[PDB]
């Protein structure tokens, strides 16, 4: 098979700049059999470029493809707000293979997260389960670090986090890490804290609460 590798996995550019998306192939791919696709969030993919360089019907002139052999490049001359999506390259020279995809992210000024922590409700404690939630609200870039510390002991393998999509208004991200423990294990300790490390923070922020207070 012919493996298509797209780099980078995420491209962070501000609206208005020119975007260049690469699609390297493991073998020489015929120029007439390489296609580019766009997938907006929550929609089906849409054919952008066909035959490496020819654009499909209804595609703006800012989209253009180039390259031959193993190196191919999709170019967006001016990034529009609707142009921020994921782009896949596809070849059918030998069988058929899609690329890894390249998410074009809106590049924003660095924004520090507003860290909040929520103790497990007594309604949930009555069911023999305690869930502690650490909230990271509105931050850029997406990369962050959340560590759960229970009585200074680092927690690992017992928490799940979730990140929202890039906000359509301020182009920011939000994270929600949920530490799940049994009611018995929850009542064995006192201090519950999540340490948040981000680029917008000069030092990692720690929001804590003592159980029973």
């Amino acid at each position: 098979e012919i493996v298509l590798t797209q780099s980078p996995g995420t491209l962070s550019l501000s609206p208005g700049e020119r975007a260049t998306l690469s699609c390297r192939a493991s073998q020489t791919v015929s120029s007439t059999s390489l296609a580019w696709y766009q997938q907006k969030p929550g929609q089906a993919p849409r054919l952008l470029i066909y035959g490496a360089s020819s654009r499909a019907t209804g595609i703006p002139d800012r989209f253009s493809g180039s390259g031959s052999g193993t190196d191919f490049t999709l170019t967006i001359s001016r990034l529009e707000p609707e142009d921020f999506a994921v782009y896949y390259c596809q070849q059918h020279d030998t069988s058929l293979t899609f690329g890894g995809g390249t998410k074009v992210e809106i590049k924003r000024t660095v924004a520090a997260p507003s860290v909040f922590i929520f103790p497990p409700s007594d309604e949930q404690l009555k069911s023999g389960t305690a869930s502690v939630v650490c909230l990271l609200n509105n931050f850029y870039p997406r990369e962050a670090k959340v560590q759960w510390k229970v009585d200074n002991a680092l927690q690992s393998g017992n928490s799940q986090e979730s990140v929202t999509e890039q906000d359509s208004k301020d182009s920011t991200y939000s994270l929600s890490s949920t530490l799940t423990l049994s009611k018995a294990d929850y009542e064995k300790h006192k201090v519950y804290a999540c340490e948040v490390t981000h680029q917008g923070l000069s030092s990692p922020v720690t929001k804590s609460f003592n159980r029973g207070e």
């Binding site: 098979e1 015929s30 007439t32 059999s33 296609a35 696709y37 997938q39 089906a44 993919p45 849409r46 054919l47 066909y50 035959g51 020819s54 499909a56 019907t57 994921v86 896949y88 596809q90 059918h92 020279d93 069988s95 058929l96 293979t97 899609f98 690329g99 890894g100 995809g101 507003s114 860290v115 909040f116 922590i117 929520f118 103790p119 497990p120 409700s121 309604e123 949930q124 069911s127 869930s131 939630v133 909230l135 609200n137 799940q160 986090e161 979730s162 990140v163 929202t164 939000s174 994270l175 929600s176 949920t178 799940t180 929001k207 804590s208 609460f209």
Partner: protein
């Protein structure tokens, strides 16, 4: 003219099968092939196979050979895709598209791609059964106060399957609300949280309540989030 309407969402047990339909219209149906692509939640596109609407020849991907069977009904201009022996990692959105990469008559290589796509079919494979969500309040306090802003939310925990809709004050509080994508717990049940930032001055006077709706279990929960002491 060209439209591709797919069948509704499916929820199947591991080991079972699922058949997805692809109703085509607006173009000579037997002149174009039909390709099928699936997309796991969060992952990229994955080609499944190609079928000629003329002779019926199929070219499946090696990953799905033996489990997938694509058929077309020329009398109804409908393409089908059956995937048997479903496993948990088969949970994905299955798309169908009008193919212009291989000739439907002679199998020649074409200068084109997948022009028109379908709306997609979400197939969820899990051994879990339908269960209503337990809504717990994320009560605010001084720990959830960054300046004058306070944060409070709801914990939609332990439910199956997707989705759930969360609104605040019957949908009147939308600005500053973040409903996070659900995480799949080890128990097979989903769980998410929906938070909202509000001024700390309004914690004592205002009333905040989340409206959690889960249609598969017919569960409607209105949990009031109050600041605890």
């Amino acid at each position: 003219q060209v439209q591709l309407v797919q069948s509704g969402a499916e929820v199947k047990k591991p080991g079972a099968s699922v058949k997805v339909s692809c109703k085509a219209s607006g173009y000579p149906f037997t002149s174009y092939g039909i390709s099928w692509v699936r997309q796991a939640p969060g992952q990229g596109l994955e080609w499944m196979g190609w079928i000629s609407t003329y002779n019926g020849n199929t070219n499946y991907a090696q990953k799905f050979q033996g489990r997938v069977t694509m058929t077309t009904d020329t009398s109804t201009t409908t393409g089908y895709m059956e995937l048997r022996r479903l496993r948990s990692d088969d949970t994905a959105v299955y798309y169908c598209a009008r193919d212009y990469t291989r000739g439907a008559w002679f199998g020649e290589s074409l200068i084109g791609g997948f022009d028109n796509w379908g709306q997609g079919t979400l197939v969820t494979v899990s051994s879990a059964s339908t269960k209503g969500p337990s809504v717990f309040p994320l009560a605010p306090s001084s720990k959830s106060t960054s300046g004058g802003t306070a944060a409070l939310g709801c914990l939609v925990k332990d439910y199956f399957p997707e989705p759930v809709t969360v609104s605040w004050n019957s949908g009147a509080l939308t600005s500053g609300v973040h409903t996070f994508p659900a995480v799949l717990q080890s128990s097979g049940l989903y769980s998410l949280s929906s938070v909202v930032t509000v001024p700390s001055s309004s914690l004592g006077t205002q009333t905040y309540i989340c409206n959690v709706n889960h249609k598969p279990s017919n569960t409607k929960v209105d949990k009031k989030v109050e600041p605890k002491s």
